[PDB]
Amino acid sequence: MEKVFYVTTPIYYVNAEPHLGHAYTTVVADFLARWHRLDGYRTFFLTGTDEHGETVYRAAQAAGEDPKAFVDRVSGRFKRAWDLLGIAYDDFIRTTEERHKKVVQLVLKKVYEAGDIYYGEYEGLYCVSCERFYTEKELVEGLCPIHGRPVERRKEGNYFFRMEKYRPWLQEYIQENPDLIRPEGYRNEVLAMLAEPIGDLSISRPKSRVPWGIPLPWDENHVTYVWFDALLNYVSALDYPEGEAYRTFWPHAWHLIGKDILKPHAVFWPTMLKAAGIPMYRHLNVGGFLLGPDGRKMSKTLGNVVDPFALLEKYGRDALRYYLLREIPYGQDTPVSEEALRTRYEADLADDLGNLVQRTRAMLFRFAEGRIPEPVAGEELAEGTGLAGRLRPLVRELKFHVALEEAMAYVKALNRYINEKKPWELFKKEPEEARAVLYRVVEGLRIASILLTPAMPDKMAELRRALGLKEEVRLEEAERWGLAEPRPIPEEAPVLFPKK
Ligand SMILES: [Zn+2]
To answer: Could you give the cofactor binding note from the entry?
Structure first.
């Protein structure tokens, strides 16, 4: 009713093996969602797969499999992948689902009846083998990417959407809403395109060419092609018309995308919503490219490709997520490598966090009889309760690297604290002081673990379990000092982050 959060990731092409780019955007959405769930927000985190089209159709035909049966099996590679990355999405939308088809046809009819749709002719480079149109850039120097054959100018009957008519409105909307497209840099690029005519939008293709897809309500001989299909998922998953979910979440829609699909989300999408009578989204959040270790765009030929799943099996899901959130500023092109991840893992996780936990546990068994000491003021460590409040705005503004840098900064402060106070020496003189010092460390770690939960859900819960703290938490608990209770700690706990 008040605190509402809705985040979406793009709907990914089904016949595409999940890669680093899909992993990053999805992990960022997961973090954003987990964080808000923790801040007491009624939240919805959506993800899904794009399954229609002729490429997908021809791939199914090759394997001698039914189209539906094909996407059904391959869409699962994404579900399995998200399972491995620990993605807690609320819904997984598939464009072949009935609920989606229903909404697409519904928005199509409404827009067609509004007179924004007309039959026309599309012209351009065409590949007879592909049965699809290409643009200059899309052509690998003259010829078709696949088939490597010459394309020829061709025309084809297509239904169009009067998108140009909406350019004036869109231009001004972005001018009136400077926060619409989060990373500022990107907001200036959209405005540049709206300065020139954007033209009309082809929204269909003959079933003769594209037999796999959603038919137009007024012309079953045609199929919805891309746009009015994939884009509507954001609204389809909410049962848009009479759905409670649509009424609750749509008003706070946060779209996460990569810069590659910026025009479709910043220009096309807003005008389709306008013509459909649907309110504009709240924010379009653009992430940059995760460049190879050589600072170049990942690629086979360059052999600079980084596989997240291989890296996940080596260091674990928690390590991977942390590295990507702490090391890559959202919106900026950043190179990634296995070396950068191993360093962060060695320093931040295995040493600063894991060792401190292992160290504190050993010291509780020795100086506190295997139990958390009696609560005491935090002194210079009490300032950590003001982190949640300083992090909230940092997170909302897509500054995840700065947020985590702050949380880990506190963890480093904890290390320095215990290394300075030296509880094993203070015990000889005053046991009460040694215990006091230890309590501040367990309570300092409790708070830290909370702040880091969205980044490493399993590991942070493991940290609390290992210190006898309450596993399930809420961000508000990280704002009050003295919550850790004096209870025994598990006699044996595995090393949080083992040596690799
Ligand atoms: Zn081709």
So the answer is: Binds 1 zinc ion per subunit.
